[PDB]
Ligand code: HEM
């Protein structure tokens with residue numbers, strides 16, 4: 001009936017009652033914890049009888065949020081949803097419900113350290129969209145609004161929900177802005193090695209690649225289950241930041257840059273049992289996402305050895321900590337570069353601090369805050385951020401952002 | 415059914431069947447995960463005090479069965495007699511006694527099963543000091559000193575455990591009251607601040623309240639507070655020649671040595687409970703050698719520990735106005751370089767987090783290859799700095815609770831009735 005979490009740095013103890021409202025699996029069992037597993041069918045669309053309680057729980061939740069639970073408006077809405085689920089095997093969210101649902105899917109996203117901002121989310125209703133060109137128009141507008149000349153604003157564009165599973169809208173891109181990766185005959189990789197497969201798909205589909213190190217990939221948009229189509233985002237809408245270092249003159253000669261807008265486009269938004277297979281959302285970067293993961297993962301841009309060399313570090317023994325030392329300067333560079341170009345960014349320290357403040361506030365007013373310590377802790381300097389010392393309960397509330405199969409793994413080509 | 419773990423850096427998938435042998439709850443359910451909770455579960459294997467026969471024997475049968483299975487017996491004459499020997503023993507003493515071999519097996523396998531330990535690749539290479547004949551705090555001291563001396567081994571550290579007599583009724587517990595054998599005092603200053611190690615302030619007070627004369631410095635090795643057969647604990651001063659200490663200097667910053675910092679060489683956990691076939695060894699100090707990040711990240715930089723980042727940052731001439739300068743991160747690296755360089759130049763065994771995590775991946779491979787799995791706690795295995803540039807960050811881990819094991823136990827001062 002109650003669970004406690006303790007910060008071992010401050011001794012503060014919070015009491016989680018919200019986890020009683022979770023209803024879906026974590027992957028853990030009573031005797032094995034799967035807390036570090038990253039991911040614990042198209043005929044799988046909810047039956048009528050499956051949708052009824054899921055819609056009821058979400059509509060109940062929504063009217064409780066606006067302090068209208070039990071109200072005549074609550075009861076009629078509840079009756080109105082059941083009518084559509086009966087007549088049409090599905091139902092349609094009102095705009096208020098869509099906005100509440102999208103905001104609460106972010107709020108419920110246990111892996112996201114940025115949720116102190118959840119209620120500040122621009123929701124673009126794109127459920128009238130019917131074609132890939134239309135999705136392109138919507139996404140360009142998303143990108144322009146969110147980028148806001150460097151003063152980033154978080155935003156989500158919601159395309160039509162799933163119907164039979166055979167007419168899904170999908171952004172085939174995993175993020176809206178990503179650099180291409182190209183494998184060379186000699187086995188080396190040009191660009192972002194994470195996107196080699198997606199770059200091949202685009203190339204095959206008709207895209208003519210510049211074959212450079214920072215080619216923004218084209219959108220690959222699927223509307224209504226049709227074949228996906230290519231669109232080049234207009235380059236004046238892709239805000240980019242050249243990476244220089246405040247102290248090392250040579251750093252700019254690495255020729256590094258990154259894009260300013262992090263925009264996840266491969267995830268599924270589930271509101272009231274409705275599934276929105278195409279719902280790109282964006283915010284602004286934490287420095288480590290670029291500085292530690294994008295640049296320093298061995299499977300990614302892999303510049304640690306490049307950087308440590310320019311730093312004249314001893315790289316024969318790990319215990320010199322050359323990797324660690326070089327990782328810090330890259331992450332300084334990334335933050336300095338964004339900040340100098342007045343492009344919104346947040347360092348892992350400010351971000352984790354904000355999240356602790358946000359978590360404590362969510363325990364006060366909501367009864368808890370599901371959190372994935374494996375994801376919340378930044379990928380460098382973990383214990384010197386306050387979330388490291390923070391105990392966290394992980395559970396799945398709905399509305400939620402979910403993962404879904406890659407479109408090419410399931411699409412049936414026309 | 416049969417669970418898979420993947421390593422996202424290498425795409426290696428391992429298949430875990432060992433988890434089927436798990437005994438105790440993790441704290442998790444299908445609906446809530448507790449993987450970041452430090453003490454998620456109070457599920458023990460036996461009740462409060464001295465157990466009935468139906469409580470202790472099935473645990474004993476299980477461990478004996480496991481140990482005789484381990485050595486290609488099971489059902490052999492020795493195994494069946496051992497079952498009867500243990501049964502009669504519980505019948506007549508409400509407990510039983512481990513053979514020396516079963517004791518060594520159990521201590522090694524508790525370390526092998528320690529889901530939070532990144533250093534388990536050495537698990538089978540553990541020196542077990544049977545001290546089950548001990549009877550007094552003076553005895554406990556003798557044993558602990560021999561442990562420290564053997565384990566320290568003039569810098570070439572060696573893994574050891576020293577196993578004092580098991581719990582009987584709960585009144586006559588043996589306990590090392592120190593959480594680790596070698597820790598620095600912590601002193602509550604008049605002006606609100608803290609000198610020394612702030613984590614140890616309370617234990618330091620117990621020691622002073624027990625008659626210890628504090629030198630009142632920043633690196634005052636604490637005395638031992640040893641409790642034998644439930645009696646009042648007794649202070650003992652570890653002879654300093656036995657406490658190997660490394661002065662921290664830096665290979666480039668010559669000003670670093672002037673920070674006046676040192677650490678001890680021997681990490682030696684002395685407050686855990688070793689659990690084997692229902693038997694509880696409330697005093698089982700175990701030691702190995704440090705991962706550098708334990709001293710330089712956690713012991714030195716945690717806000718409620720030595721907290722030397724501002725000092726080292728200031729000396730480095732760092733923008734400390736905002737977080738985005740990453741001044742903490744820069745100092746943190748230099749500090750851990752200093753720790754590693756000092757231990758290596760004094761030829762005191764130490765491992766860096768790159769080497770240690772690389773080894774643990776190798777250990778995982780081995781364990782899945784021959785044991786069908788390896789329980790690991792990602793939250794504890796991933797080092798506290800530079801997580802993602804180490805192999806374990808990218809390695810899915812299954813956590814489950816295997817016996818024999820080390821367990822946490824209450825701090826004896828919360829429980830002990832003085833006399
Ligand atoms: C506004 C600033 C934001 C910041 C600084 C931020 C920060 C982060 C970071 C660092 C991660 C881990 C990313 C990774 O390691 O791949 C993450 C994950 C995530 N964020 Fe946020 N985020 C922000 C906004 C948002 C928004 C606007 C949404 C949705 C409306 C959102 C939903 C999520 C989700 C669902 C995840 C988990 C992804 C997964 O499960 O794989 N975030 N965030």
Ligand code: HEM
Nearest residue numbers: 525528530531532533536573575700701702703704705820
């Ligand atoms: C030989 C070198 C060893 C290394 C490098 C090593 C490394 C580590 C580290 C870094 C931790 C986490 C430390 C912390 O943040 O508190 C840990 C935990 C642990 N280790 Fe090992 N260890 C070693 C030896 C041993 C031995 C010999 C044993 C038992 C005989 C052992 C049993 C454990 C246990 C039970 C934990 C969990 C502690 C807790 O829950 O608080 N380790 N180890």
Ligand SMILES: Cc1cc(N)nc(COc2cc(CCN3CCCCC3)cc(F)c2F)c1
Nearest residue numbers: 175177261262263264281282283284285286
């Ligand atoms: C809204 C939002 C804000 C933020 N600050 N961050 C995110 C997550 O953003 C990205 C994450 C990645 C890598 C995704 N990662 C790959 C390995 C497997 C796990 C997922 C690439 C990108 F382009 C991203 F924008 C989302």
Ligand SMILES: Cc1cc(N)nc(COc2cc(CCN3CCCCC3)cc(F)c2F)c1
Nearest residue numbers: 594597680681682683700701702703704705
């Ligand atoms: C055998 C062994 C080897 C090794 N390499 N490391 C360890 C861990 O030993 C220590 C651990 C701590 C901190 C314990 N921690 C405090 C915060 C709350 C959680 C528990 C302090 C020390 F002095 C230690 F020696 C043990």
Ligand SMILES: C[C@H](O)[C@H](O)[C@H]1CNc2nc(N)[nH]c(=O)c2N1
Nearest residue numbers: 388389390391450451452793794
């Ligand atoms: C909240 C969290 O469980 C706590 O701070 C943990 C995190 N991981 C850890 N990992 C190790 N190795 N040692 C620790 O003390 C901790 N502390």
Ligand SMILES: C[C@H](O)[C@H](O)[C@H]1CNc2nc(N)[nH]c(=O)c2N1
Nearest residue numbers: 036037038374375807808809810
């Ligand atoms: C296996 C492990 O869960 C995996 O490497 C996780 C660890 N934590 C992470 N945390 C974040 N923020 N992003 C990630 O991609 C990962 N990867």
Ligand SMILES: [Zn+2]
Nearest residue numbers: 028033442447
């Ligand atoms: Zn779990």
